[PDB]
Amino acid sequence: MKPEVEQELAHILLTELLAYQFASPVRWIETQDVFLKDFNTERVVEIGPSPTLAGMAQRTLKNKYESYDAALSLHREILCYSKDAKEIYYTPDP
Amino acid sequence: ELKPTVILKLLKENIIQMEMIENRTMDGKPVSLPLLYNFNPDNGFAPISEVMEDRNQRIKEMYWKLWIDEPFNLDFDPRDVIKGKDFEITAKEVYDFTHAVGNNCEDFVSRPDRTMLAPMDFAIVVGWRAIIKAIFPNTVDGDLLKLVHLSNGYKMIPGAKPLQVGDVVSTTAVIESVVNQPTGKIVDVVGTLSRNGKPVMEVTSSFFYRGNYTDFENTFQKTVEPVYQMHIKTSKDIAVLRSKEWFQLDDEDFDLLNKTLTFETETEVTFKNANIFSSVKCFGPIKVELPTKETVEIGIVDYEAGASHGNPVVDFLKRNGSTLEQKVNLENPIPIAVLDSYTPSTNEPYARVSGDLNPIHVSRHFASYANLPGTITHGMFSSASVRALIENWAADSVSSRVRGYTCQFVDMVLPNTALKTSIQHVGMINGRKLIKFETRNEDDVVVLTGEAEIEQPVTTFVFTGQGSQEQGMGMDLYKTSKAAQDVWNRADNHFKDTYGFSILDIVINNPVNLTIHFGGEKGKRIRENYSAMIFETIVDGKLKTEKIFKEINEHSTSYTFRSEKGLLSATQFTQPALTLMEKAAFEDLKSKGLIPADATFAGHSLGEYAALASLADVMSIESLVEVVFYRGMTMQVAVPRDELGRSNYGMIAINPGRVAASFSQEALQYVVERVGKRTGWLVEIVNYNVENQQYVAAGDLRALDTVTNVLNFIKLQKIDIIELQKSLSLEEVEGHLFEIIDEASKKSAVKPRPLKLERGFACIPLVGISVPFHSTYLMNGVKPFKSFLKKNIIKENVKVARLAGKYIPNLTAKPFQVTKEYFQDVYDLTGSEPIKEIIDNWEKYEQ
């Protein structure tokens, strides 16, 4: 795979992925069971005006990832940009 | 036991031999250092004169048998790379090193079903034999008793793993620069570690021979300079570069405008004196970025000068070129911790494991001869002890998170000393955390300084879809932030020059009505853009490419956007507003350097488009605003409204865990599909939000009134679909559910077509939503969207290494990869023809 041909195939793929995305269901459980397990991500930052995704990501971890996190011994931070902005920018109050 | 340490005696008639015999050696045979004196009885005042000839060569020869495991020879060139003998990292040596330094990290302990890592402390051990060898040669002529270790730095090479147990390490080391300072001679030694062939990390050390050194012919400076980028935007920058005779392009007529030039330069300097340079020759290949990001050599720096007072090349690329990863400090330096370590009474246990058998740290008599206040504790131990506390408190008990670590030994520490370290997080560098520490003795005297570059913990970005659009959202950032201001300005200007309005106006004050006026030659351009917007619809089994804005022709003077409450609640202004606020927020995090280089990103529907432009910068902010506005308009025109602007579609936020405690998502998907089949009215699951807790089902407004009635009935009757289909009867739940879908659908087909969607026990009707997007219903709406995307997203602005394993679409629910298997998976979900061309012709795109 050359850099320019791979670039073309990637460009065509993401285009077709964005083109049909609003014509396919949002399989977010089979993404929340990718970045929480397969990537073992210990910081979940939500960017938005309301903590929906951080309130959506604290329920999956409570449900099916108590036993998985207790068997690995990691600590997962769940943050929203609207609500938890201080612990994102590292700007606490004395 | 009471061993002989000194033997004072006569060697000749006039010569004395004060021979200092140290016992802690490599083998176990005590090594003797015979320092001489010339006893002249004719000098009544000072009859002792110490022999200076061969004195440094003897001292070195003793330290050779202390450190080096080879034959003693100093007649080697320092310039030449030194290749230390390979060393296997063994579990026992990681135990004994971690026990000596008191490091209490789990990563370096023997665990079940786990690799034991090796501390980057341990690296100085393996290196040591090569690194120290650097200071030995006859052209680095100095007394090793007066060896000050100024500073020691470890730098984990990006894309490497820290050292593991069983890793065979091939160690090199070369002298950076030997300089005759006024106070002595600074030697800077860099030791590379090469495991499996590939480089892992580069230890740096700084040795300062104290005294007087006038031998400037021996002095050199073999620095490799940090890569410097120049974005050539304007023709004065080209004219400046072409004035630079050193800047030697391979092709003279290489056009440099709107490119990116990296300069992999190295500085070679040879001295005449401490202040002036005899000869400087900065050279190294000049790379240019392609739209593919694969950089190509297009020339060389070939600066060759004599009696220079600096590097012009470095000076030039410093002011006019960026250091790639710019470091930026925090607003207030956070005081992480104030810890109290403790130096052991003896340093022997660290000396044995580290191979650092310097007598001065262990023997009293050598320390007395070295004018030291006693058996000074190993600097390397003080370096390893603090780093174990920096790994405990900042990295948070993780080994791989610690990358860089530089520590300066300001003052010596004596055994039995209760140190007090002060840890301070001060800056960020491309996502990484830059911490400065200062350790003090009991007198509050500075003994250790230094800065540790730590990896921020592995992060996943989730960009929110269409939620709460509160008035003036993102203006708080827009007042303060400059990175946010730039995004908001560019977006605002682009909408003024493309769609004849201001987003900033619409977010800030949320006008009820806003009239685009196509007045003048700017007006015509606006009306051309508003004309070209089209959408496809299925009417009587016929794809008709209809025109958005039917009341915008060639002879339309104005358009009016009309809302009831505010235009911010309209999708065509909701979607860009929210996406821009997220993009502006992310650009604020990225300016302050809080984005890890390897982080994952995955947005929820609309957020996805922001997230793509956030981490990957695939589309420009002028491309993004168009593609989120067009999306908002296409969604808005998808359904066939009345004169009230009301539709016959909507959504419900269903909770499968409320209807029952046995009702799963396979029990819901069966009930939704059967409801959709039996009545014939479109209904699908468009959002799988949280498992067995949050789903959203779009489709026909009556078909969601049947679903609410069906899951109100089954909840009251207390029946499970999965129990009766398996262990009671086969295919009986199918026909037994049809009769419940038929008793819901008769009452759901008698209320009119603008039926108020009524909240049940598990479901909530998502108010403001009138279109089933993420449903099969909008497949027809994709081709104009796909034409618009392919126009906006130019393939020159996409990069794979910022997507491959990082971008997670919502179509697939799989990480982005460029492979035949993923392309198959995307086709299976969405049956397009350009994906069948790539799958078929795959074996041609492989070469």
PDB file of C-alpha atoms in Angstrom, chain B residues 290-539:
ATOM      1  CA  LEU B 290       3.537  16.154   0.673  1.00  0.00           C
ATOM      2  CA  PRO B 291      -0.322  16.155   0.931  1.00  0.00           C
ATOM      3  CA  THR B 292       0.230  12.423   1.904  1.00  0.00           C
ATOM      4  CA  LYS B 293       2.454  13.695   4.886  1.00  0.00           C
ATOM      5  CA  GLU B 294       5.245  11.310   3.629  1.00  0.00           C
ATOM      6  CA  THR B 295       8.179  13.821   3.658  1.00  0.00           C
ATOM      7  CA  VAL B 296      10.634  13.846   0.649  1.00  0.00           C
ATOM      8  CA  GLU B 297      14.247  15.223   0.626  1.00  0.00           C
ATOM      9  CA  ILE B 298      14.354  18.270  -1.785  1.00  0.00           C
ATOM     10  CA  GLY B 299      17.773  19.697  -0.743  1.00  0.00           C
ATOM     11  CA  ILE B 300      20.404  19.906   2.041  1.00  0.00           C
ATOM     12  CA  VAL B 301      21.680  22.452   4.564  1.00  0.00           C
ATOM     13  CA  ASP B 302      25.477  22.551   3.723  1.00  0.00           C
ATOM     14  CA  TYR B 303      26.699  25.479   5.927  1.00  0.00           C
ATOM     15  CA  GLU B 304      30.562  25.355   6.065  1.00  0.00           C
ATOM     16  CA  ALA B 305      32.274  28.228   8.014  1.00  0.00           C
ATOM     17  CA  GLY B 306      35.615  28.878   9.826  1.00  0.00           C
ATOM     18  CA  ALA B 307      36.042  31.640  12.515  1.00  0.00           C
ATOM     19  CA  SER B 308      32.285  31.737  13.510  1.00  0.00           C
ATOM     20  CA  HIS B 309      30.734  33.025  16.856  1.00  0.00           C
ATOM     21  CA  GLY B 310      27.558  30.892  16.437  1.00  0.00           C
ATOM     22  CA  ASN B 311      25.294  28.825  14.161  1.00  0.00           C
ATOM     23  CA  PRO B 312      23.386  31.145  11.776  1.00  0.00           C
ATOM     24  CA  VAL B 313      21.327  28.119  10.513  1.00  0.00           C
ATOM     25  CA  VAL B 314      20.063  27.301  14.100  1.00  0.00           C
ATOM     26  CA  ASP B 315      19.494  31.058  14.818  1.00  0.00           C
ATOM     27  CA  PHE B 316      17.577  31.351  11.471  1.00  0.00           C
ATOM     28  CA  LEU B 317      15.380  28.226  12.013  1.00  0.00           C
ATOM     29  CA  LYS B 318      14.777  29.263  15.736  1.00  0.00           C
ATOM     30  CA  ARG B 319      13.057  32.675  15.119  1.00  0.00           C
ATOM     31  CA  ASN B 320      11.621  31.774  11.617  1.00  0.00           C
ATOM     32  CA  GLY B 321      10.853  28.052  12.434  1.00  0.00           C
ATOM     33  CA  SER B 322       8.724  26.242  15.105  1.00  0.00           C
ATOM     34  CA  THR B 323      10.155  23.366  17.343  1.00  0.00           C
ATOM     35  CA  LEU B 324       7.199  21.071  16.232  1.00  0.00           C
ATOM     36  CA  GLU B 325       5.853  20.343  19.789  1.00  0.00           C
ATOM     37  CA  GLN B 326       5.739  23.809  21.478  1.00  0.00           C
ATOM     38  CA  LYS B 327       5.653  23.562  25.331  1.00  0.00           C
ATOM     39  CA  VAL B 328       3.055  25.812  27.131  1.00  0.00           C
ATOM     40  CA  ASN B 329       2.886  26.282  30.962  1.00  0.00           C
ATOM     41  CA  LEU B 330      -0.250  26.066  33.187  1.00  0.00           C
ATOM     42  CA  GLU B 331      -1.978  29.200  34.613  1.00  0.00           C
ATOM     43  CA  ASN B 332      -0.860  28.250  38.191  1.00  0.00           C
ATOM     44  CA  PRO B 333       1.914  25.598  38.741  1.00  0.00           C
ATOM     45  CA  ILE B 334      -0.041  22.851  40.682  1.00  0.00           C
ATOM     46  CA  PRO B 335       1.933  21.664  43.780  1.00  0.00           C
ATOM     47  CA  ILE B 336       1.377  17.854  43.206  1.00  0.00           C
ATOM     48  CA  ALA B 337       3.046  16.658  46.505  1.00  0.00           C
ATOM     49  CA  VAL B 338       5.624  17.534  49.263  1.00  0.00           C
ATOM     50  CA  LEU B 339       7.223  14.088  50.071  1.00  0.00           C
ATOM     51  CA  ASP B 340      10.014  13.144  52.602  1.00  0.00           C
ATOM     52  CA  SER B 341      12.358  10.366  51.220  1.00  0.00           C
ATOM     53  CA  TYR B 342      15.402   9.027  53.226  1.00  0.00           C
ATOM     54  CA  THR B 343      19.049   8.132  52.179  1.00  0.00           C
ATOM     55  CA  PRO B 344      20.327   4.784  53.581  1.00  0.00           C
ATOM     56  CA  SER B 345      23.289   4.683  56.084  1.00  0.00           C
ATOM     57  CA  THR B 346      25.401   2.831  53.387  1.00  0.00           C
ATOM     58  CA  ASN B 347      25.298   3.029  49.524  1.00  0.00           C
ATOM     59  CA  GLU B 348      27.072  -0.390  48.986  1.00  0.00           C
ATOM     60  CA  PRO B 349      23.847  -2.332  48.005  1.00  0.00           C
ATOM     61  CA  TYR B 350      23.156   0.144  45.088  1.00  0.00           C
ATOM     62  CA  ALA B 351      26.908   0.222  44.057  1.00  0.00           C
ATOM     63  CA  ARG B 352      26.881  -3.657  43.635  1.00  0.00           C
ATOM     64  CA  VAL B 353      23.703  -3.748  41.387  1.00  0.00           C
ATOM     65  CA  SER B 354      24.525  -0.433  39.484  1.00  0.00           C
ATOM     66  CA  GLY B 355      28.218  -1.476  38.990  1.00  0.00           C
ATOM     67  CA  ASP B 356      28.989   2.102  40.303  1.00  0.00           C
ATOM     68  CA  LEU B 357      31.897   0.933  42.585  1.00  0.00           C
ATOM     69  CA  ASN B 358      33.301   4.501  43.083  1.00  0.00           C
ATOM     70  CA  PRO B 359      35.244   4.308  46.401  1.00  0.00           C
ATOM     71  CA  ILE B 360      34.315   7.937  47.400  1.00  0.00           C
ATOM     72  CA  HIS B 361      30.645   6.774  47.961  1.00  0.00           C
ATOM     73  CA  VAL B 362      31.742   3.830  50.267  1.00  0.00           C
ATOM     74  CA  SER B 363      35.424   4.258  51.503  1.00  0.00           C
ATOM     75  CA  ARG B 364      36.140   6.951  54.154  1.00  0.00           C
ATOM     76  CA  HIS B 365      39.833   7.470  53.104  1.00  0.00           C
ATOM     77  CA  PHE B 366      39.138   8.115  49.335  1.00  0.00           C
ATOM     78  CA  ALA B 367      36.335  10.588  50.391  1.00  0.00           C
ATOM     79  CA  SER B 368      38.872  12.385  52.700  1.00  0.00           C
ATOM     80  CA  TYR B 369      41.428  12.548  49.804  1.00  0.00           C
ATOM     81  CA  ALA B 370      38.574  13.833  47.507  1.00  0.00           C
ATOM     82  CA  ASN B 371      37.965  16.724  50.042  1.00  0.00           C
ATOM     83  CA  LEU B 372      34.336  15.471  50.419  1.00  0.00           C
ATOM     84  CA  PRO B 373      32.436  15.882  53.745  1.00  0.00           C
ATOM     85  CA  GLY B 374      32.198  12.003  53.940  1.00  0.00           C
ATOM     86  CA  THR B 375      30.976   8.938  51.928  1.00  0.00           C
ATOM     87  CA  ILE B 376      28.629  11.099  49.710  1.00  0.00           C
ATOM     88  CA  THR B 377      25.455   9.114  48.688  1.00  0.00           C
ATOM     89  CA  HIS B 378      25.186   8.066  44.977  1.00  0.00           C
ATOM     90  CA  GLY B 379      23.617  10.897  42.884  1.00  0.00           C
ATOM     91  CA  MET B 380      22.231   8.006  40.705  1.00  0.00           C
ATOM     92  CA  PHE B 381      20.382   6.630  43.841  1.00  0.00           C
ATOM     93  CA  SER B 382      18.936  10.148  44.586  1.00  0.00           C
ATOM     94  CA  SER B 383      17.980  10.247  40.806  1.00  0.00           C
ATOM     95  CA  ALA B 384      16.246   6.774  41.073  1.00  0.00           C
ATOM     96  CA  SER B 385      14.535   7.437  44.509  1.00  0.00           C
ATOM     97  CA  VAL B 386      12.844  10.744  43.414  1.00  0.00           C
ATOM     98  CA  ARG B 387      11.853   9.199  39.959  1.00  0.00           C
ATOM     99  CA  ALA B 388      10.115   6.300  41.876  1.00  0.00           C
ATOM    100  CA  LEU B 389       8.086   9.033  43.790  1.00  0.00           C
ATOM    101  CA  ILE B 390       7.440  10.913  40.432  1.00  0.00           C
ATOM    102  CA  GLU B 391       6.253   7.510  38.976  1.00  0.00           C
ATOM    103  CA  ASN B 392       4.101   6.883  42.170  1.00  0.00           C
ATOM    104  CA  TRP B 393       2.367  10.360  42.398  1.00  0.00           C
ATOM    105  CA  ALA B 394       2.344  11.897  38.811  1.00  0.00           C
ATOM    106  CA  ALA B 395       2.347   8.776  36.513  1.00  0.00           C
ATOM    107  CA  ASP B 396      -0.026   7.228  39.219  1.00  0.00           C
ATOM    108  CA  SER B 397       1.790   3.811  39.734  1.00  0.00           C
ATOM    109  CA  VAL B 398       2.374   3.249  35.924  1.00  0.00           C
ATOM    110  CA  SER B 399       5.828   2.622  34.297  1.00  0.00           C
ATOM    111  CA  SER B 400       5.162   3.388  30.543  1.00  0.00           C
ATOM    112  CA  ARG B 401       3.668   6.872  31.422  1.00  0.00           C
ATOM    113  CA  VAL B 402       7.162   8.121  32.526  1.00  0.00           C
ATOM    114  CA  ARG B 403       9.109   8.953  29.301  1.00  0.00           C
ATOM    115  CA  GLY B 404      11.506  11.885  29.901  1.00  0.00           C
ATOM    116  CA  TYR B 405      13.327  12.470  33.228  1.00  0.00           C
ATOM    117  CA  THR B 406      16.249  14.968  33.705  1.00  0.00           C
ATOM    118  CA  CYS B 407      17.740  15.525  37.260  1.00  0.00           C
ATOM    119  CA  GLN B 408      20.580  17.999  38.182  1.00  0.00           C
ATOM    120  CA  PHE B 409      22.662  17.191  41.373  1.00  0.00           C
ATOM    121  CA  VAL B 410      22.878  20.804  42.780  1.00  0.00           C
ATOM    122  CA  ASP B 411      24.608  19.674  46.061  1.00  0.00           C
ATOM    123  CA  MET B 412      25.993  16.376  47.496  1.00  0.00           C
ATOM    124  CA  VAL B 413      23.891  14.417  50.105  1.00  0.00           C
ATOM    125  CA  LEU B 414      25.525  12.538  53.083  1.00  0.00           C
ATOM    126  CA  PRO B 415      24.210   9.129  54.331  1.00  0.00           C
ATOM    127  CA  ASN B 416      21.341   9.257  56.912  1.00  0.00           C
ATOM    128  CA  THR B 417      19.649  12.406  55.420  1.00  0.00           C
ATOM    129  CA  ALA B 418      15.814  12.999  55.507  1.00  0.00           C
ATOM    130  CA  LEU B 419      15.371  14.827  52.129  1.00  0.00           C
ATOM    131  CA  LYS B 420      12.144  16.799  51.286  1.00  0.00           C
ATOM    132  CA  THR B 421      11.100  16.754  47.558  1.00  0.00           C
ATOM    133  CA  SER B 422       8.566  19.341  46.192  1.00  0.00           C
ATOM    134  CA  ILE B 423       6.771  18.060  43.002  1.00  0.00           C
ATOM    135  CA  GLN B 424       5.230  20.814  40.733  1.00  0.00           C
ATOM    136  CA  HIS B 425       3.237  20.240  37.439  1.00  0.00           C
ATOM    137  CA  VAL B 426       4.169  23.456  35.480  1.00  0.00           C
ATOM    138  CA  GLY B 427       3.542  22.819  31.707  1.00  0.00           C
ATOM    139  CA  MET B 428       2.129  20.608  28.896  1.00  0.00           C
ATOM    140  CA  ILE B 429       4.003  19.474  25.675  1.00  0.00           C
ATOM    141  CA  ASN B 430       1.775  18.019  22.839  1.00  0.00           C
ATOM    142  CA  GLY B 431      -0.579  16.321  25.407  1.00  0.00           C
ATOM    143  CA  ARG B 432       2.241  15.172  27.788  1.00  0.00           C
ATOM    144  CA  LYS B 433       2.557  16.472  31.425  1.00  0.00           C
ATOM    145  CA  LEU B 434       5.825  18.420  32.247  1.00  0.00           C
ATOM    146  CA  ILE B 435       6.550  18.290  36.073  1.00  0.00           C
ATOM    147  CA  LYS B 436       9.467  20.164  37.810  1.00  0.00           C
ATOM    148  CA  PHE B 437      10.687  18.829  41.223  1.00  0.00           C
ATOM    149  CA  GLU B 438      13.083  20.452  43.772  1.00  0.00           C
ATOM    150  CA  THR B 439      14.553  18.277  46.619  1.00  0.00           C
ATOM    151  CA  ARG B 440      16.170  19.951  49.706  1.00  0.00           C
ATOM    152  CA  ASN B 441      18.256  18.525  52.636  1.00  0.00           C
ATOM    153  CA  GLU B 442      17.346  19.315  56.353  1.00  0.00           C
ATOM    154  CA  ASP B 443      19.063  22.787  55.999  1.00  0.00           C
ATOM    155  CA  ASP B 444      16.507  23.610  53.130  1.00  0.00           C
ATOM    156  CA  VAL B 445      19.637  23.694  50.821  1.00  0.00           C
ATOM    157  CA  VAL B 446      18.847  22.736  47.160  1.00  0.00           C
ATOM    158  CA  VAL B 447      20.477  19.290  46.456  1.00  0.00           C
ATOM    159  CA  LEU B 448      18.225  18.050  43.534  1.00  0.00           C
ATOM    160  CA  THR B 449      16.362  19.920  40.779  1.00  0.00           C
ATOM    161  CA  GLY B 450      14.866  18.424  37.577  1.00  0.00           C
ATOM    162  CA  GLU B 451      11.846  17.995  35.213  1.00  0.00           C
ATOM    163  CA  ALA B 452       9.985  14.725  34.332  1.00  0.00           C
ATOM    164  CA  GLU B 453       8.001  14.560  30.986  1.00  0.00           C
ATOM    165  CA  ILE B 454       5.074  12.104  31.746  1.00  0.00           C
ATOM    166  CA  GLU B 455       2.504  10.579  29.287  1.00  0.00           C
ATOM    167  CA  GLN B 456      -1.046  11.752  30.154  1.00  0.00           C
ATOM    168  CA  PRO B 457      -3.227   8.621  30.755  1.00  0.00           C
ATOM    169  CA  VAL B 458      -4.747   6.967  27.550  1.00  0.00           C
ATOM    170  CA  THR B 459      -7.812   9.156  26.548  1.00  0.00           C
ATOM    171  CA  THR B 460     -11.020   8.651  24.417  1.00  0.00           C
ATOM    172  CA  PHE B 461     -12.892  11.730  23.021  1.00  0.00           C
ATOM    173  CA  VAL B 462     -16.730  11.507  22.705  1.00  0.00           C
ATOM    174  CA  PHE B 463     -18.380  14.450  20.837  1.00  0.00           C
ATOM    175  CA  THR B 464     -22.132  14.822  21.775  1.00  0.00           C
ATOM    176  CA  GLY B 465     -24.877  14.694  19.087  1.00  0.00           C
ATOM    177  CA  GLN B 466     -28.022  16.944  18.935  1.00  0.00           C
ATOM    178  CA  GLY B 467     -28.841  17.679  22.630  1.00  0.00           C
ATOM    179  CA  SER B 468     -29.605  20.940  24.556  1.00  0.00           C
ATOM    180  CA  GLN B 469     -29.005  24.065  22.358  1.00  0.00           C
ATOM    181  CA  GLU B 470     -29.074  26.698  25.189  1.00  0.00           C
ATOM    182  CA  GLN B 471     -28.860  30.346  23.927  1.00  0.00           C
ATOM    183  CA  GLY B 472     -25.270  31.721  23.634  1.00  0.00           C
ATOM    184  CA  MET B 473     -23.605  28.281  24.096  1.00  0.00           C
ATOM    185  CA  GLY B 474     -19.763  28.497  23.735  1.00  0.00           C
ATOM    186  CA  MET B 475     -19.600  32.346  24.188  1.00  0.00           C
ATOM    187  CA  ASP B 476     -17.851  31.905  27.645  1.00  0.00           C
ATOM    188  CA  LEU B 477     -14.842  30.343  25.780  1.00  0.00           C
ATOM    189  CA  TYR B 478     -15.220  32.839  22.842  1.00  0.00           C
ATOM    190  CA  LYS B 479     -14.720  35.838  25.246  1.00  0.00           C
ATOM    191  CA  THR B 480     -11.556  34.387  26.988  1.00  0.00           C
ATOM    192  CA  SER B 481      -9.893  31.795  24.606  1.00  0.00           C
ATOM    193  CA  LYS B 482      -8.011  32.995  21.474  1.00  0.00           C
ATOM    194  CA  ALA B 483      -7.965  29.472  19.861  1.00  0.00           C
ATOM    195  CA  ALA B 484     -11.816  29.454  20.160  1.00  0.00           C
ATOM    196  CA  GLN B 485     -12.012  33.112  18.829  1.00  0.00           C
ATOM    197  CA  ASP B 486     -10.093  32.129  15.603  1.00  0.00           C
ATOM    198  CA  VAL B 487     -12.526  29.191  14.871  1.00  0.00           C
ATOM    199  CA  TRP B 488     -15.678  31.321  15.650  1.00  0.00           C
ATOM    200  CA  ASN B 489     -14.380  34.268  13.480  1.00  0.00           C
ATOM    201  CA  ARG B 490     -13.443  32.024  10.435  1.00  0.00           C
ATOM    202  CA  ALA B 491     -16.844  30.222  10.669  1.00  0.00           C
ATOM    203  CA  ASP B 492     -18.764  33.555  11.065  1.00  0.00           C
ATOM    204  CA  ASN B 493     -16.872  35.158   8.080  1.00  0.00           C
ATOM    205  CA  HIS B 494     -17.450  32.012   5.954  1.00  0.00           C
ATOM    206  CA  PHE B 495     -21.274  32.068   6.619  1.00  0.00           C
ATOM    207  CA  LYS B 496     -21.352  35.863   5.851  1.00  0.00           C
ATOM    208  CA  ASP B 497     -19.502  35.235   2.496  1.00  0.00           C
ATOM    209  CA  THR B 498     -21.344  31.914   1.618  1.00  0.00           C
ATOM    210  CA  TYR B 499     -24.925  31.958   3.130  1.00  0.00           C
ATOM    211  CA  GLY B 500     -25.286  35.739   3.833  1.00  0.00           C
ATOM    212  CA  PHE B 501     -25.772  35.449   7.662  1.00  0.00           C
ATOM    213  CA  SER B 502     -23.743  35.379  10.946  1.00  0.00           C
ATOM    214  CA  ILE B 503     -23.796  32.229  13.195  1.00  0.00           C
ATOM    215  CA  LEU B 504     -22.475  34.464  16.082  1.00  0.00           C
ATOM    216  CA  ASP B 505     -25.684  36.615  15.824  1.00  0.00           C
ATOM    217  CA  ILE B 506     -27.882  33.415  15.876  1.00  0.00           C
ATOM    218  CA  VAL B 507     -26.063  31.783  18.885  1.00  0.00           C
ATOM    219  CA  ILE B 508     -25.789  35.066  20.986  1.00  0.00           C
ATOM    220  CA  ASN B 509     -29.353  36.580  20.700  1.00  0.00           C
ATOM    221  CA  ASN B 510     -31.320  33.715  18.906  1.00  0.00           C
ATOM    222  CA  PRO B 511     -33.500  35.855  16.552  1.00  0.00           C
ATOM    223  CA  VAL B 512     -37.054  34.500  15.845  1.00  0.00           C
ATOM    224  CA  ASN B 513     -36.685  35.472  12.107  1.00  0.00           C
ATOM    225  CA  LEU B 514     -33.615  36.197   9.894  1.00  0.00           C
ATOM    226  CA  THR B 515     -33.923  37.354   6.228  1.00  0.00           C
ATOM    227  CA  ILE B 516     -31.063  36.653   3.771  1.00  0.00           C
ATOM    228  CA  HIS B 517     -30.985  39.598   1.270  1.00  0.00           C
ATOM    229  CA  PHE B 518     -29.376  38.730  -2.144  1.00  0.00           C
ATOM    230  CA  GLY B 519     -28.603  42.472  -2.781  1.00  0.00           C
ATOM    231  CA  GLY B 520     -25.540  43.198  -5.036  1.00  0.00           C
ATOM    232  CA  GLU B 521     -22.808  40.956  -6.660  1.00  0.00           C
ATOM    233  CA  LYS B 522     -22.257  39.337  -3.184  1.00  0.00           C
ATOM    234  CA  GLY B 523     -26.085  38.696  -3.083  1.00  0.00           C
ATOM    235  CA  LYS B 524     -26.031  36.803  -6.473  1.00  0.00           C
ATOM    236  CA  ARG B 525     -23.109  34.607  -5.173  1.00  0.00           C
ATOM    237  CA  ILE B 526     -25.187  33.854  -1.996  1.00  0.00           C
ATOM    238  CA  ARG B 527     -28.311  32.957  -4.149  1.00  0.00           C
ATOM    239  CA  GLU B 528     -26.137  30.629  -6.391  1.00  0.00           C
ATOM    240  CA  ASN B 529     -24.996  28.680  -3.239  1.00  0.00           C
ATOM    241  CA  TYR B 530     -28.640  28.518  -1.844  1.00  0.00           C
ATOM    242  CA  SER B 531     -29.820  27.397  -5.385  1.00  0.00           C
ATOM    243  CA  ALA B 532     -27.294  24.478  -5.917  1.00  0.00           C
ATOM    244  CA  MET B 533     -28.522  22.716  -2.659  1.00  0.00           C
ATOM    245  CA  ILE B 534     -30.714  19.694  -3.769  1.00  0.00           C
ATOM    246  CA  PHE B 535     -32.186  16.544  -2.027  1.00  0.00           C
ATOM    247  CA  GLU B 536     -33.466  13.151  -3.350  1.00  0.00           C
ATOM    248  CA  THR B 537     -36.870  11.644  -2.246  1.00  0.00           C
ATOM    249  CA  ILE B 538     -38.793   8.372  -3.070  1.00  0.00           C
ATOM    250  CA  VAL B 539     -42.316   9.394  -4.375  1.00  0.00           C
TER     251      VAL B 539
END
